[PDB]
Amino acid sequence: PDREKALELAMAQIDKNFGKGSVMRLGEEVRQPISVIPTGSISLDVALGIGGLPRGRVIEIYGPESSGKTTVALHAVANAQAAGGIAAFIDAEHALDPEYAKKLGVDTDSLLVSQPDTGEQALEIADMLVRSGALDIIVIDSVAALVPRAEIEGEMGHVGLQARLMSQALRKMTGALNNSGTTAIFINELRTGGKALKFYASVRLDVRRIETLKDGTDAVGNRTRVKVVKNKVSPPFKQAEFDILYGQGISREGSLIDMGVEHGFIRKSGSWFTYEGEQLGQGKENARKFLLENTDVANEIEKKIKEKLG
Numbered sequence: 001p002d003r004e005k006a007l008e009l010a011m012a013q014i015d016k017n018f019g020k021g022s023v024m025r026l027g028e029e030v031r032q033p034i035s036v037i038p039t040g041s042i043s044l045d046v047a048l049g050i051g052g053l054p055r056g057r058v059i060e061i062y063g064p065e066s067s068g069k070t071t072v073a074l075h076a077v078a079n080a081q082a083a084g085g086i087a088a089f090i091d092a093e094h095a096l097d098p099e100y101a102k103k104l105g106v107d108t109d110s111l112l113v114s115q116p117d118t119g120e121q122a123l124e125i126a127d128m129l130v131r132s133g134a135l136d137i138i139v140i141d142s143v144a145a146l147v148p149r150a151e152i153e154g155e156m157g158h159v160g161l162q163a164r165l166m167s168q169a170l171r172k173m174t175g176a177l178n179n180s181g182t183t184a185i186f187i188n189e190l191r192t193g194g195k196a197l198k199f200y201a202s203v204r205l206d207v208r209r210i211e212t213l214k215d216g217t218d219a220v221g222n223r224t225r226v227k228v229v230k231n232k233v234s235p236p237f238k239q240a241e242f243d244i245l246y247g248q249g250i251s252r253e254g255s256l257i258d259m260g261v262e263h264g265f266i267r268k269s270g271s272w273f274t275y276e277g278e279q280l281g282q283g284k285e286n287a288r289k290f291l292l293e294n295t296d297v298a299n300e301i302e303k304k305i306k307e308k309l310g
């Protein structure tokens with residue numbers, strides 16, 4: 001017996017039988033792909049281990065209200081579009097603020113939006129789109145808002161039908177999703193169908209608000225924390241953090257400062273961030289700004305960090 005040789009032989013057959021990623025060692029550092037979707041969060045992009053959401057996969061983003069799920073998803077779309085991709089937003093919440101979306105860099109005008117009459121119609125419309133192979137990314141707002149038709153329409157006290165709907169739906173949309181090469185983000189709100197999504201998801205993000213961006217003493221935004229509780233394309237359980245200002249989305253410069261520091265590219269003498277010899281400022285915010293204005297800097301930092309990792 002040769003354990004490691006026997007185990008590898010095992011794994012190999014396991015992945016063959018159920019797909020790559022069926023099993024993997026946690027420390028394992030996986031081989032990156034040909035063009036993921038920058039989550040808009042450098043840290044998260046890293047936690048996902050492939051620099052962003054995997055295309056042609058089902059992505060669930062759950063968490064409480066105000067935790068930043070929609071924000072993240074928007075950025076996802078933006079990038080998808082920045083890459084000349086076509087986007088679709090299946091809205092069953094009617095909560096979208098396109099003005100903010102634009103600010104996150106979404107081309108709202110070219111963005112397709114549907115506002116279904118029932119959970120069925122929703123997913124159906126979603127299926128039909130996906131399988132046109134024109135969409136790079138699609139978003140479904142509120143797994144919960146996918147209420148069956150029988151219930152929306154007047155129906156008696158019943159079933160366990162919302163889950164079945166969601167289940168069957170995913171069943172076919174996945175095949176398509178894969179052939180299409182389109183990523184499907186399902187925003188799930190922690191306040192029914194998530195039962196299925198748990199198993200169909202390739203990636204599952206547990207998003208929640210941790211801090212109240214205050215800087216010194218005033219409301220700015222909030223610090224989010226995402227845990228990749230499920231990851232079928234890279235070791236799971238990675239966590240990342242980042243800032244979302246009010247009105248502004250995920251602070252790229254905020255991620256850059258933070259990750260740049262923990263990775264020694266930007267030195268932080270107490271109270272004063274410094275990089276490569278140039279002074280960046282006292283207090284994250286001053287640094288953030290500096291990086292915001294001096295777009296050349298940060299870009300360097302964005303490169304440097306990118307390299308050392310993935």
Ligand SMILES: Nc1ncnc2c1ncn2[C@@H]1O[C@H](COP(=O)(O)OP(=O)(O)OP(O)(O)=S)[C@@H](O)[C@H]1O
Pocket residue numbers: 063064065066067068069070071072095097100189221222244245246247248
């Ligand atoms: N329309 C908006 N205008 C200004 N800031 C917004 C807006 N929407 C979201 N934000 C910012 O993003 C934070 C919340 O992130 P969301 O985009 O709401 O993601 P989320 O909470 O999962 O989505 P919900 O609550 O289902 S909409 C807010 O606290 C603000 O910092």
Ligand SMILES: [Cl-]
Pocket residue numbers: 038039040041042045
């Ligand atoms: Cl990003």
